[PDB]
Amino acid sequence: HWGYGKHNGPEHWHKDFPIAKGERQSPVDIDTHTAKYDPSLKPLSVSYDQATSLRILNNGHSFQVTFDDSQDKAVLKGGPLDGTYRLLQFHFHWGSLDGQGSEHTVDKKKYAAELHLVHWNTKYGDVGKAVQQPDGLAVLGIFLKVGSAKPGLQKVVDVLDSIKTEGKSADFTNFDPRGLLPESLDYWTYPGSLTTPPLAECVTWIVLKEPISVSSEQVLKFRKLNFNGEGEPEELMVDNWRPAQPLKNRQIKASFK
Ligand SMILES: [N]S(=O)(=O)[C][C]C1234B567B89%10B%11%12%13B85%14B%1158B%12%11%15B%139%12B%1061B%12%112C5%153B%14874
Ligand SMILES: [Zn+2]
């Protein structure tokens, strides 16, 4: 039932998922002046050299690129994390226009899109078990602004015409997610949640300070996707972002001064 429209969007989700009004919901606004520099935070360790992408999929809420998470081939460690987190998939959230699309905001600024690289804690064995734990997932969030093209995104862009409508997938092997990362791994971190149903409070969020630039042509291809299935009335997959939620009793920590 849930989606991003008037009648099934974020303001409705608490009816099926009451944790929507919980104590550690995501995304949030990152108030940069209030975030505390924490000299105890480690550099983030991103080890993607042996990543194995499998498929690209439109599931009616975003598109995702899925990885082989049956071994420690593409792992996130360090930073605020204890232990080792396997990359399951990445996906994006984006807007109908360049002034909205991100889920996190920075001093209330919205970016055109936000990339989420979703990882789960190997100590829980599988993602389903991990989503039931407060330290089950680590999502690496990367902002997208519109300017110069991101060359490492183009292979993704170019196959979106083959997964237009909900329920389409395609082979998507040999994709290297290192080509989506900004120079700096400086980050903010806080305890939060999945930003889509089931909104489980299982995520350590790691949001990079440095956005990547993508071109207008690249983001326009995102906007040609459809929320609908083939044969149903065409509804552009745009504005698939949850707004900032109350910070409540949480501290955002910065890895950098
Ligand atoms: N937007 S997000 O918080 O990164 C949650 C995205 C997910 B990945 B795992 B299941 B797969 B399905 B559910 B679980 B995580 B939530 C949706 B996607
Ligand atoms: Zn997401």
Residue numbers in the entry: 4 to 260
Task: Please give the exact wording used by the authors of the publication that reports this structure.
This reaction is essential for many physiological processes, such as pH homeostasis, bone development, and electrolyte secretion. CA II is highly expressed in red blood cells and is essential for blood pH regulation. The zinc ion is coordinated by three conserved histidine residues, H94, H96, and H119 (CA II numbering will be used throughout the manuscript), and as the fourth ligand serves the sulfonamide moiety instead of the bound solvent. sulfonamide complexes also provide additional hydrogen bonding between the sulfonamide nitrogen N1 and OG of T199 as well as between the sulfonamide oxygen O1 and NH of T199.
CA IX-mimic is an engineered variant that is widely used in structural studies to resemble hardly crystallisable CA IX. CA IX-mimic contains seven amino acid substitutions (A65S, N67Q, E69T, I91L, F131V, K170E, and L204A) in the CA II active site to mimic the active site of CA IX while retaining good crystallisation properties. Methyl and ethyl linkers (1a and 2a) did not allow carborane clusters to make favourable hydrophobic interactions with hydrophobic residues due to their short length. The largest extent of buried surface area was observed for compounds with short linkers. Clusters of 1a and 2a were buried deeply within the active sites of CA IX and CA II in a similar manner, not reaching the hydrophobic patch at the active site opening.
